[PDB]
């Protein structure tokens, strides 16, 4: 019943963990504790098998541990900066090659899976810093330029007309802009890792850069030159909706150094490079 | 069922492309590959006719390629500028003879059809540039003056009363103004091209200027003269809703030079005038 299912959503009890049943002492030639890790399988022994447990009714749920929950939280993926210093025409617009590889926080979560398919919710948080005192009337334009569409080279470029491209206009004072984007890949899922090239020569590119092109985001201060200079920083937040993930993998142990690559750097003292805290010895807890 | 049809709208699967069926080797005196282009008809040969194909279930849809989708995107059609320099009375109001011929981006899309019928959605994006520092309280008035109605000659002209004409008042800080306009022509469709004149003499006008008069848009800063000068730029965006188009035509190959006319200019080196990139020779890919 969708209504009973609805209540489960509200109470967050869609996925319940099993109970612990009462066990008793045993003397058998069947030893569940013994197994063989060589098989590649995990021994499914439970607490009732090693000790005498009591009956306990579990009331915990796994809803929050779902992939939708794990990846369904908005995190910053980019910080666009438009700092008017000495040339309005040149400093009033910018572009960014879209990707989820620049911020370690969210990148690491997505990278715990090999492939992922999801829709995106983008929320933008613009903040206008009054460098000279007043900010006037700030109106911004965020244009999504898919690969192929002409990228504007000036703040008054004809590409800004957005005859076909999607543009979001934000007027300072109004609530934060937000919009959704369907699964944009030409494949069935986004490659989180890609052991491939775009060719077979020594100079061929390697990794996700070959497969993950999401276009460019071109920003612009629509308002014309004002007496007082401002610094507009627009933070882009991304949330995954309707997510699916395949083939889980180990979490990134070292820091990220570049986008679209697993490359890393190690110091002379590697223990400083990983989260592992050195032990004094095996018996020191 | 409107509900099943509704789901199709949400999933964007209203128009599905056909599947590819499995074909087999053939030896026949019926050769589909051979035909005669002289007839003016395109040979309807499909992949199953030239090679041995496999069965593949198509999941692509043509919804996004519909005329409604193609022309149903808001693009800029005009940039109204009110720059208060030295005379408020004269610089605080302006007019524009409405047309969709001034911005190449949207003009070219509509011009891929000979006739088009649609309703219009107009969204305006005003941006007030604080030239002297503060902007005060900016209130704008956009009046639609149909052909015949008196056009205001001063910022305090009686025509601004809008006793009958439609006027939209925008107060700085409020969301972007937007309104719809029904199919405005005296004909059954808008002429995108018109091989005709408004007379039969040497001095008769030629082209769409003869048929496409949509009136004038008169803007004005309602607010009286303020200490600090401002530059108000209002960008008009137009979207076609409930569109129908007839007789498709070749896309504009060269740049547009003027409104209501197909006129163009060519340089001494014509290859620079068209998008065609010169080939080294026939065999160089």
């Amino acid at each position: 019943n969708p209504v009973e299912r609805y209540v489960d959503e509200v109470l967050n009890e869609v996925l319940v963990v099993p109970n612990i049943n009462q066990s008793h002492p045993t003397t058998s030639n069947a030893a569940p504790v013994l197994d063989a890790a060589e098989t590649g399988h995990t021994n499914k022994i439970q607490p009732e098998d090693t000790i005498e447990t009591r009956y306990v009714q579990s009331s915990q749920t796994l809803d929050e541990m779902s992939v939708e929950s794990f990846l369904g939280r908005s995190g910053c993926i980019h910080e666009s900066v438009l700092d008017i210093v000495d040339n309005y025409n040149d400093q009033s617009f910018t572009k960014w090659n879209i990707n989820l590889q620049e911020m370690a926080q969210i990148r690491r979560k997505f990278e715990m899976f090999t492939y992922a398919r999801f829709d995106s919710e983008i929320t933008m948080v613009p903040s206008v810093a009054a460098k000279d005192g007043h900010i006037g009337h700030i109106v911004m334009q965020y244009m999504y330029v898919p690969p192929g569409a002409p990228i504007p080279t000036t703040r008054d470029d004809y590409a800004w007309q957005s005859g076909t491209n999607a543009s979001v206009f934000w007027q300072h004072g109004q609530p934060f802009p937000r919009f959704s984007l369907p699964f944009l890949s030409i494949a069935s899922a986004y490659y989180m890792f890609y052991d491939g090239y775009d060719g077979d020569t020594y100079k061929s590119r390697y990794g996700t850069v070959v497969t993950n092109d999401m276009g460019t985001l071109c920003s612009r201060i629509v308002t014309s030159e004002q007496l007082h200079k401002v610094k507009v920083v627009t933070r882009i937040y991304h949330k995954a909706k309707h997510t699916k993930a395949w083939c889980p993998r180990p979490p990134r142990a070292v820091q990220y150094s570049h986008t679209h690559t697993t490359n890393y750097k190690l110091s002379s003292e590697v223990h400083n490079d990983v989260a592992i805290r050195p032990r004094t010895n095996l018996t020191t807890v | 069922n409107p509900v099943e049809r509704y789901v199709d709208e949400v999933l964007n699967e209203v128009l599905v492309v056909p599947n590819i069926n499995q074909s087999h080797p053939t030896t026949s005196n019926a050769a589909p590959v051979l035909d005669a282009a002289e007839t003016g008809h395109t040979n309807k040969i499909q992949p199953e006719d030239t090679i041995e194909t496999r069965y593949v279930q198509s999941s692509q849809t043509l919804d996004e390629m519909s005329v409604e989708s193609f022309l149903g995107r808001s693009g800029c059609i005009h940039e109204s500028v009110l720059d208060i320099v030295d005379n408020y009375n004269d610089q605080s109001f302006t007019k524009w003879n409405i047309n969709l011929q001034e911005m190449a981006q949207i003009r070219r899309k509509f011009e891929m059809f000979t006739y088009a019928r649609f309703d219009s959605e107009i969204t305006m994006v005003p941006s007030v540039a604080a030239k002297d520092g503060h902007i005060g309280h900016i209130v704008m008035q956009y009046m639609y003056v149909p052909p015949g109605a008196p056009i205001p000659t001063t910022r305090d002209d009686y025509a601004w009363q809008s006793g009958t004409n439609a006027s939209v008042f925008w107060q700085h800080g409020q969301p972007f103004p937007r309104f719809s306009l029904p199919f405005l022509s005296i004909a059954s469709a808008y002429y995108m091209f018109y091989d005709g004149y408004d007379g039969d003499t040497y001095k008769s006008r030629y082209g769409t200027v003869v048929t496409n008069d949509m009136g004038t848009l008169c803007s004005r800063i309602v607010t009286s003269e303020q200490l600090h000068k401002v530059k108000v730029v209002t960008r008009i965006y137009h979207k076609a809703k409930h569109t129908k188009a007839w007789c498709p035509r070749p896309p504009r190959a060269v740049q547009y030079s003027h409104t209501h006319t197909t006129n163009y200019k060519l340089s001494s080196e014509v290859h620079n005038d068209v998008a065609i990139r010169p080939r080294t020779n026939l065999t160089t890919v």
Partner: peptide, 29 residues
Amino acid sequence: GAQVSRQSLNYFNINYFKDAASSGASRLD
């Protein structure tokens, strides 16, 4: 877009926009 259930505890699962991507978080399997 409204999925109306009844039990009365009537449930309305409305979808304000015509694109599937527009909807919120998904239900659990």
